[PDB]
Amino acid sequence: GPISKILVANRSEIAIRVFRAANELGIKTVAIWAEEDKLALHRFKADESYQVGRGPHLARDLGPIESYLSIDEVIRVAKLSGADAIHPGYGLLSESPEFVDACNKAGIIFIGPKADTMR
Amino acid sequence: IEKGKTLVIVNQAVSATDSQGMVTVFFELNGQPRRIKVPDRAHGAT
Ligand SMILES: [Cl-]
């Protein structure tokens, strides 16, 4: 099944960069945003977008950056949105093998190299 | 507005009603100011 919806597990310029590529290729896009980024540009730049880091499913509010660093939150969003692939951009969870493994686990294409490659 | 299209809306202020009997509500929508004008039916205005 060719890649049909990408979630971009990032913010700012690089989220926006990836949204452009996917969109030019005919691929739908999902953004995530923490509460502190509820007014950020990048979140209005995707086909649809969802909040990470607060709500019923969490013991406490996640911090502004911590919300983007949560593996469970990204995965939870890829499922809720029905994304088939995730772009980590740069920084954040882009060099996490625990993150790569989580994506494998849920059958979501990690747009990056294999977990063994990151170790 | 839809799954995955979240508006943030702040009621900044509400004006005294004017003559012609209009009230303007000053909102912020996703950070941006927006004024909306509504009749003040409560209080007799068309
Ligand atoms: Cl934080």
Distance of CA A87 to the CA centre of its chain: 6
Residue A39 in contact with partner chain B when CB distance is under 8 A:
yes
Nearest to A47 by CA among A31, A34, A36, A60: A31
Distance of CA A94 to the CA centre of its chain: 10
Q: Which tokens hold the place of A82?
A: 């029905």
Q: Report the SS3 class of residue A34.
A: coil
The reply to whether residue A44 touches residue B30, judged by beta carbons under 8 angstroms, is yes
Cβ-in-10-Å burial (0-12, 13-18, 19+) of A76 comes to middle
Nearest to A29 by CA among A12, A39, A44: A44
Range list of H helices, A1-119: 12-24, 66-69, 71-81, 97-106, 115-118
Q: Are A18 and A6 in contact (CB under 8 A)?
A: yes
**How many angstroms is the resolution?**
2.4
**Which residues, 6+ apart, have CB-to-CB distance to B31 below 8 Å?**
A39, B8
Instruction: Please tell me the distance from the alpha carbon of residue A78 to that of residue A55, in angstroms, as a whole number.
Output: 17
SS3 content of chain A, % helix, strand, coil (to 5): 40, 15, 45
CB atoms within 10 A of CB A55: 11
| DSSP structure class, residue A45 | S
Residue B6 in contact with partner chain A when CB distance is under 8 A:
yes
Q: Please, which experimental method was used?
A: X-ray
> Which chain B residues are closer than 8 Å to A51 by Cβ?
6
> Which chain B residues are closer than 8 Å to A44 by Cβ?
30
Establish, for the pair of chains A and B, how many residue pairs have beta carbons separated by less than 8 Å.
Answer: 19
Q: Report the SS3 class of residue A22.
A: helix
Find the helix packing angle between A71-81 and A97-106, rounded to 10°: 30
Residue keyed to tokens 């969802």: A50
CB atoms within 10 A of CB B25: 14
Read out DSSP for B19-45? TTSEEEEEEEETTEEEEEEEE-TTTT-
Q: Which tokens hold the place of A74?
A: 């990204």
Give the DSSP H/E element, type plus range, for residue A6.
Answer: strand A5-8
Backbone angles phi, psi at A33, to 5 degrees: -150, 140
Residue keyed to tokens 């004024």: B35
Pairing mode, if any, of strands B22-29 and A5-8? Answer: unpaired
Residue A54 in contact with partner chain B when CB distance is under 8 A:
no
The reply to whether residue B4 touches residue A51, judged by beta carbons under 8 angstroms, is no
